[PDB]
């Protein structure tokens, strides 16, 4: 027979061979979900939504040189690419606020803040916004294994002047490139590996690949992946003015007939990565999924800083094979077109030899580049392409490419496998998954390619759900000025006819941290909450529903005090039995336990129905007060108020012994 | 004979299960050999 020792082993071998191939797939090919993204970009763009708007206009972020950075703009510009020490370009994208920092918020003294490279401060602000954008309380990440992978390089800050006398050494850890991530991990409390790589403008995708490796292996929970590039000296412009590599007008003309140089910009960009299974087990928000990645080197070429074709084709094929896909499951590819008269044809020909090769005919493959809108970021270009891809996937449209009025004649465009984006093309979801890919080719040799996809089918149509019951809105900030700032923000948020009051209350209560200065408004309707926040932002508290204060100790020891007799009034909790179920349940259980020993119901006396005694006789007053106090204590404990001691004045000691557990409800009724 | 049929399937499960687990060990716990080393150090040590 089966002996159930040979056929019972079969059921536990054929159900292990299946948690092995599947475990193998989890080990090597686990997709990584993207949770949230943050960015500081030139031209006043400090939010992804403004970035998307700027992308759909087909606008420009080209301005003049900064004036408040201490530069010498009258002894710098020269219309001749000779006379070294001078630059022949007068354009360029720059940040509007690069010298701003909130020192007291992060606990940094003014002098230490004045001794920082602005890249670190911008990274701190961007990381805080990135954490808050995911609907995650930033105080819940303390002690968790979260990695910080960054791409950042030194540009020269305070290194031309003599160092001031700071015995504590504030001028080394501020400008060092290895503290840009350690400082984030120290000020935020993360417990994971922190690495600051160098890949010569392909650093962001290298950090992303390392984060994917770490997440798949299992040594990290979340990853903060990004890059930063904020100038402090005009040296880059001067140096590249000597090689005549800069564009005359400062515009990057990607894949256009006339490209004659690149143009630089400043920016900080960060994204948050997590495993998809843990992302939808915890209930987070998924924007896109990274499927596979590939890295290689240009190798032996005709120059140290010269591109090659076969290396690009090989890295493209490695990126395709590592996830189990083929060339043709693609809608659009993000390219690295910097306006290089020499690199653009090479990259395009590499793209037509894999993707436009023998391709389906009823569309070409869409080719675009983001560098024609904002310019070269030189440290966060790949992650900028990642943000562009995520925005296109979320909003369902492919933005156009500028300066492609006709294409360069050095790319064989007649094949029909690759066509440039000369307009906005619909990218709505249908029968086929919508995938696309980003490509960053560094100058030191390391080339990379990443394949993004759309997020699985999901429902989020449950936010709109409101009741007529009161809602508490609680705001908190480190300073009073910030308190009114946040109050005004929330008040102007509650103006629009589609802002759910319950949703806003839940988001404030759950997805925001708690700080020293606090305020709260309990509102039954919508204009009442508006007016309460109006007063809070107005710098006063006179109304009835507004309660505000400040705390310095983050937790208390609660003691319950039960007073004696003499504080009753006809109609205690007349509605609370109808609006709160715990109160009614506790009163009702007390009522059954007291039923054998009296002929009247406690709720009957509380609700003033006819046929019940008044509250002038002691023998009815005392049990009613006992029931009211015990129900109120249980209602207090149902909200997360855990007592540590109980005290009773005259006859409240019975209820105190009840709540302490030293007695039961039974002998208490007796 | 129900031993013969249910045993021969359990020897083609002992094979595949070993192969899969051994590939798992290769994936996560492969030792890395060191081949050669070079150094320039102060004091004439090269």
């Amino acid at each position, epitope marked *: 027979t089966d002996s159930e020792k040979v*056929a019972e082993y079969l059921r536990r071998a054929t159900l292990d061979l299946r948690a092995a191939r599947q475990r193998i797939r989890e080990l090597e090919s686990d997709p990584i979900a993207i949770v949230s993204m943050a960015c500081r970009l030139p031209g006043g763009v400090n939010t992804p939504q403004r970035l998307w708007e700027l992308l759909r206009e087909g606008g420009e972020t080209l301005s003049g040189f900064p004036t408040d950075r201490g530069w010498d703009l009258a002894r710098l510009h020269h219309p001749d690419p000779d006379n070294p020490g001078t630059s022949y370009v007068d354009k360029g994208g720059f940040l509007d606020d690069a010298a701003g920092f909130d020192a007291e918020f992060f606990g940094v003294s003014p002098r230490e803040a004045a001794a920082m490279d602005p890249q670190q401060r911008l990274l701190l602000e961007t990381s805080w916004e990135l954490v808050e954008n995911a609907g995650i309380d930033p105080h819940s990440l303390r002690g968790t294994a979260t990695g910080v992978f960054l791409g950042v390089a030194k540009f020269g800050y305070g290194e031309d002047t003599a160092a001031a006398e700071d015995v504590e050494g504030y001028s080394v850890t501020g400008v060092a490139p290895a503290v840009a991530s350690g400082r984030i991990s120290y000020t935020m409390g993360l417990e994971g590996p922190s690495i600051s790589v160098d890949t010569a403008c392909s650093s962001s995708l290298v950090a992303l690949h390392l984060a994917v490796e770490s997440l798949r292996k299992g040594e990290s929970s979340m990853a903060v992946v990004g890059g930063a590039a904020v100038m402090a000296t005009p040296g880059v412009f001067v140096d590249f003015s000597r090689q005549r590599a800069l564009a005359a007008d400062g515009r990057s003309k990607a894949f256009g007939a006339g490209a004659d140089g690149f143009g630089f910009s400043e920016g900080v960009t960060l994204v948050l990565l997590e495993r998809l299974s843990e992302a939808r087990r915890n209930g987070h928000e998924v924007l896109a999924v990274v499927r596979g990645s590939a890295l290689n080197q240009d190798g032996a070429s005709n120059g140290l800083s010269a591109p090659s074709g076969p290396a690009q084709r090989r890295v493209i094929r490695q990126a395709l094979e590592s996830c189990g896909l083929e060339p043709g499951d693609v809608d659009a590819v993000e390219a690295h077109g910097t306006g290089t008269a020499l690199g653009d044809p090479i990259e395009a020909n590499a793209l037509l030899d894999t993707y436009g090769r023998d391709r389906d005919a009823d569309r070409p493959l869409w080719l675009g580049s983001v560098k024609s809108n904002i310019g070269h970021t030189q440290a966060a270009a790949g992650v900028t392409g990642l943000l562009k891809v995520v925005l296109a996937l979320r909003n369902g449209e492919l933005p156009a490419t500028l300066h492609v009025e006709e294409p360069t004649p050095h790319v064989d465009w007649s094949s029909g496998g690759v066509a440039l984006l000369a307009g906005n093309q619909p990218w709505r979801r249908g029968e086929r998954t919508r995938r696309a890919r980003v490509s960053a080719f560094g100058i030191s040799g390391t080339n990379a390619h990443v394949i993004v996809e759309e997020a699985p089918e999901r429902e989020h149509r449950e936010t709109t759900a409101h009741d007529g019951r009161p809602v508490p809105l609680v705001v908190s900030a480190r300073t009073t000025a910030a308190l009114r700032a946040q109050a005004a923000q929330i008040a102007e948020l509650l103006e629009r006819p589609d802002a759910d009051l319950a949703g806003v209350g839940l988001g404030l209560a759950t997805t925001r941290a708690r700080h020293e200065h606090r305020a709260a408004v309990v509102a039954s309707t919508r204009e009442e909450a508006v007016r309460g926040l109006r007063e809070i932002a107005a710098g006063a508290a006179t109304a009835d529903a507004v309660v505000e204060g400040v705390t310095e100790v983050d937790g208390r020891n609660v003691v319950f005090l039960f007073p004696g007799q003499g504080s009753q009034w006809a109609g205690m909790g007349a509605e609370l039995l109808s609006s709160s179920p715990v109160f009614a349940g506790k009163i009702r259980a007390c009522d059954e336990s007291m039923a054998p020993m009296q002929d009247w119901k406690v709720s009957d006396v509380l609700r003033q129905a006819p046929g019940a005694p008044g509250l002038d006789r002691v023998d009815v007053v005392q049990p009613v007060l006992f029931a009211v106090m015990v129900s109120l204590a249980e209602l207090w404990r149902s909200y997360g108020v855990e007592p540590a001691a109980v005290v009773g004045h005259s006859q409240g000691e019975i209820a105190a012994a009840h709540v302490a557990g030293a007695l039961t409800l039974e002998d208490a009724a007796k | 004979t129900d031993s013969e049929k249910v045993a*021969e*399937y359990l020897r083609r499960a002992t094979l595949d299960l070993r192969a899969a687990r051994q590939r798992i060990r290769e994936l996560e716990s492969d030792p890395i050999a060191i081949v050669s080393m070079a150094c320039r150090l102060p004091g004439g040590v090269n």
Partner: antibody
Amino acid sequence: EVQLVQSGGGLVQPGRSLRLSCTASGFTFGDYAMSWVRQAPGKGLEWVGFIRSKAYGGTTEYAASVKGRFTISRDDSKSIAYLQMNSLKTEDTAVYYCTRGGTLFDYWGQGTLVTVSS
Amino acid sequence: DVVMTQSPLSLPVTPGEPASISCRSSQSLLHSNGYNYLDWYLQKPGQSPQLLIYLGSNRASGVPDRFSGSGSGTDFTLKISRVEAEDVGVYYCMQSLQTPRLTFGPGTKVDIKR
């Protein structure tokens, strides 16, 4: 994977004997049953017989058209499977495969092509 | 006695398509201890055959990932994901409810479609 090595092909006269030989390397031969599959042109695979491993007996089973004409033996000490054929007919010019396992034909050897010719 | 099994005799499929083979038996073919009493097989032209699928549920070790197998009752399917150059040959569907069997199967011949 493991290797089954097979030999014993050649020219035969219709009505005489011939013995094959199949050795196994990489696995224990004393635990597997062995089946024999003939392959001739104009037809597909055909099971012709199988022998049981030790600890389960030594019973052998054959096909209807070969019962009383062929025999299969084995030696687990020196670990070979032998197929001995008596009174061969001209329609059995074929290549013989030895298959590991009585029912799960998991492995197939390279085979030898032996022919009876008049 | 022996359950009859069959398969389409020939099906040339161009590379790049999710080809499929079926095995429509006459009576129910299932295994109590396992899942189904069925085993798929392959043989390229000119060499020894090989095992692909056992119980009609497992995927053999050493054969590519694109192969698979499903079905129950009297209907089964060998769902292949993609077709390549060395996919030509003959496929066989065998049952193991009672032995010795006699419905060995002519086999499906697969080649390049033109």
